[PDB]
Design a protein around this ligand. Sequence first.
Ligand code: SF4
Lengths: 156, 122, 82, 70, 318, 105, 98, 175, 114, 96
Amino acid sequence: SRGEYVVAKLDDLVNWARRSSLWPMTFGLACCAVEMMHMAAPRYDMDRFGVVFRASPRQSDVMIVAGTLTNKMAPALRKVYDQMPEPRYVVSMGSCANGGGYYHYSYSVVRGCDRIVPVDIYVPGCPPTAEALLYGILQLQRKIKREKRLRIWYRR
Amino acid sequence: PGIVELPTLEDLKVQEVKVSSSVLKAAAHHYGAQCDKPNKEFMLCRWEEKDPRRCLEEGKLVNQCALDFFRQIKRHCAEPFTEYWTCIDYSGLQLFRHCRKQQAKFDECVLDKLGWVRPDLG
Amino acid sequence: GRIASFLKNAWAKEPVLVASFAIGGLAIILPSLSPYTNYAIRINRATPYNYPVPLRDDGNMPDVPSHPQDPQGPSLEWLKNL
Amino acid sequence: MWFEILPGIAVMAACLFIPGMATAHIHKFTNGGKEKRVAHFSYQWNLMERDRCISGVNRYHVTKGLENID
Amino acid sequence: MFMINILSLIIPILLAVAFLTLVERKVLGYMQLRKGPNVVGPYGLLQPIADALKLFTKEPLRPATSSISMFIIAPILALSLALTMWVPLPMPYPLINMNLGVLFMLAMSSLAVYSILWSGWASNSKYALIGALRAVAQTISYEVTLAIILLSVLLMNGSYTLSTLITTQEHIWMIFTSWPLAMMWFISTLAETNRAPFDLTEGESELVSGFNVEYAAGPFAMFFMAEYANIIMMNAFTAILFLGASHDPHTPELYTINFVLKTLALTITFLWIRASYPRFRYDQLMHLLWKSFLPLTLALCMWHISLPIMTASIPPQS
Amino acid sequence: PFFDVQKRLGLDLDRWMTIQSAEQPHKIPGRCHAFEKEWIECAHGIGGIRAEKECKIEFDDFVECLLRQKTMKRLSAIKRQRDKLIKEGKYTPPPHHLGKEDPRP
Amino acid sequence: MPLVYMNIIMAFAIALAGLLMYRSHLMSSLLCLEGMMLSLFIMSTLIILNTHFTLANMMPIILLVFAACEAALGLSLLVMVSNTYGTDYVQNLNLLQC
Amino acid sequence: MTMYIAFILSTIFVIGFVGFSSKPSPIYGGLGLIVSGGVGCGIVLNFGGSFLGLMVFLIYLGGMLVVFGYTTAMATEMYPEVWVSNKTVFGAFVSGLMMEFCMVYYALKEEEVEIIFKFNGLGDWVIYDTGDSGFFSEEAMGIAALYSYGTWLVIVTGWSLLIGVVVIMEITRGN
Amino acid sequence: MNIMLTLLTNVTLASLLVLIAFWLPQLNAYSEKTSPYECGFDPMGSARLPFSMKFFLVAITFLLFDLEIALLLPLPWASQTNNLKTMLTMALFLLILLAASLAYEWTQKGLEWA
Amino acid sequence: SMMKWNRERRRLQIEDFEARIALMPLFQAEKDRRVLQMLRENLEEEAIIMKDVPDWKVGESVFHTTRWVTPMMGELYGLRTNEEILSATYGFIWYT
Ligand code: SF4
């Protein structure tokens, strides 16, 4: 159907815009943030891919939970995620963020950021290498490329 | 109070100098040099009398003299003047600076055929 | 002597104020002793903003010209040479 | 390398160039192949109105020369 | 056809702003041993378009504590004023030729400041309020010196008509006549556009995002477009005022090309400064302008008033 | 207590701007220079009490030039009459007033 | 008199009524003073331009200069009042009575 | 409709005055003052006063900036008031708008309205003069005579401004 | 009228952009998303409480100096007079009075803050 | 360099002003004739318009003085078309 073709092409345009311009928020909890900065560094510059760190949650599109999320910090993380406008995607970097890692059995650690906020891509490692984080970001971009919001709207 | 004594339409009818602003500006200096007398008489009438009605005849004389000036130009120096006023027309401010060469052509032709000399600065 | 010490301290510590005061003082002083200021006044006067109203001839005005391009009256040769 | 920056600068330069050229050529088209007349003082506007009257088509740019005389 | 001219001025300027974002990202990256955006489009050309689409397809959030009317009005004011200021500029022929175009631009720049203050106040957030107050302090610091420098330079022009600047600088650039005023003017333009080292209103490092901390999606895009357009417009004003260009009336394209190149160079200088220098403290910015720039500007204004008189160089009024 | 220090010392501190008929830059005339001059000349040295009635014609002309109240009233009456005639259908504006003739240069 | 004069004089009347009818804040009444000054500027400018009183086209600028002087005075007093009471509320100027 | 640009702008001016005079929070009153200043600039430019109007707009734009900062500092309130947040402010606003609308329609319809003076409904274009100023801007030449004719006004105003700086310093010393 | 048309066009473009930004996107507005931003934790007080201005004196002096900015703008046309001596004297008088005011405030610790 | 260029500019301005001076008398004559013609047309059409109205003298002056008073915009263009009125009143201001 011509309507299906138009919807598919418009969805392609929107997904391309969203994946090409991915603005992570300046959120780094722990050692994994340093590998994130190295990703921002010249060798693996993420600005080439359109990933620009923006501080304000309302002006950001992706939250990368780099570092251990303590029970004290979890409400702030949830608040920052909520204040972030949608579409919003969450990437969990490092074993500490993914499932608690080295401090899984600590009283003051949330055993994974999945408990607090929905996570789209999990980047393994402790710390994950900057190339690994870039791979995760590109995987998130492909995931956005696979999204079918307008097609589902037309079919619904 | 009293009725205003406006002049009749026929009396205020005169032959008109139907030339564009660029054409007048191109010939402005020679026009002032040649037609000074009647123009100065009309100006004195206007400033002393302070009535537009009182000086209508002098204005008619002014218009006639301007027409005669343009007629002599057409007879003797038409083409150089046409090029000159064409050049001035292009500039939005109608600057003299951009058209110095065509002005030189017009001045030389006018000096030869008609003997007019351009008034100097001031 | 002490004035020189003050000037050196000013240039070392507050150069901008020294330059500003020097420039302002020169602005005040130099125009008074400049020959060309009268030329500026004359140029401003010479500009023909308003029409040169003719004056009636009573026969006793030798200096006033009876027509432009006549030897009588003001001259602008000075500005042309300037 | 550094030359890779140049293409975006060229695109920006073309975008910036478009306005001035468009303004100049639009003025030329509207004003009969001549620059739009600048009226910064009342005298020039009076000249423009007189030209509008002289033209006969109510367009100031239309210029009547020696031919109209006599 | 005047509407066509208005669209011709507006639409290309916005595209220029979009590609200026790409140029800045690449120039800063290369000055930082990086490559600016290159993945999205050949040499990163399509990155701006992707950013605009992403922002305008992103949810706009109206803060619960915000005053909606001012919150919405502020971006509209910023963008409309940014586009308006381009109108009087002679490139070479201005869209609107005003006898007092320079004062018009000054007043319009003054008006644009309220967009930042209104946005920050309406946001009803502490960081936004701090950014608005910083913008107030910045205007207090820079407006007087900007006006005095512009007056001093325009004394040689003889008018506030922007078009006549071309005639005045026909034989030489005015930077040679007034290079100190040119330096202070460039810094003041940096201050007015809220660009580094005077990027205090946004101040990401110190204030999370400054006045726009509560703005997302389209309104933030409008604020960004206004910012970049103001950068380009102010640099173009500097090019017209000081770095004059040759204008052949029969061929305006030459003047347009020269002017565009000079403005591009000045904007690149803006990005260069943002990369090189650190940020000032707003107390330090106000002190710089009031204690250092203002006295020198007063002295130079006296000098420029006297110089035409003592040198018999008073410019023609017309 | 108007100590006329200006008149005593021959200083024109502010009298230059007191009237519209005084000297102005580049001899730019005021919109009512003639009426103001006539009124000032009429009421000179005769005192305010006398001038208020012996120069009332001059002052009324000056006020009419300044405000145009009577001229505006007459123009409004003429326009009202013209509109009423047009409504009645017994009047038709001339072609030159309607724009069918080129106005005199 | 044309209607624009009517509107501008009405604006002056409205500003005067606003200033004479305080509510709580002093800043608002200082803004009403500034509004009165703006209305006066507009009236003077219109009169001087319609009557071609060339040497009187500077009077509006002097009026504006002294209006800004007055505004500065008002704000400098408001700052002291706020410091001494914590608010700009007019009800705190109550120590002096009668 | 373009035959009466002046009237529309003056009505906008009066509405801005009814806005800042009903006394909302100083922020919205400053908004009203800014709008009224812009409209007054429009009116003065329509009458031929480009420099004066632009100067008013520029000066009030800067003045309202300091007012805005002062408000956020001294004239601040937890719930700032808009023209629809209190019955008094909205009463004042509505009364002002109604009073305008009343006089506006009265004068537009009636040939000659007379509130306190006599006003004629004929458009402002009538009063304009038919003369020519030549190669000059009469407003600019008059405003420039402050330095050639108004030496006394310059003296007085300069002294007033210096004494104003001194006065502000003394009034804000605060002992 | 050209200036009016240009202003209308620019304002209409901006308003259309705002409309497209507030209507094209999808929205899931909930209380926590529209709450004020305080770097993750909740604000203590309001953002409408008084915010002390440590540079009040400089602001009032800014008003007083913007007056002088207004007074000095006619200078370009003033240089066209025939009494250039008086014009120059008065212009330098005004600029020297502005300099004096700045110097007084500076020396009296008025340009400093707090 | 600026001194030289500005002096040349002043000389060219003098040249332009002299051209205006030369052309002004003809313009003054044209303007006076046009104003008188417009006033006469207004007077005649008014004589047609208000012949019926009682106690209305036609072309009666509102000034006691029997002296020429420059007509206001309303007098010349009062009964002309709206486009003419807009042009005369606001053309120079609006033109840009
Ligand atoms: S996962 Fe490893 S590198 Fe990352 S924050 Fe935890 S301990 Fe540090």
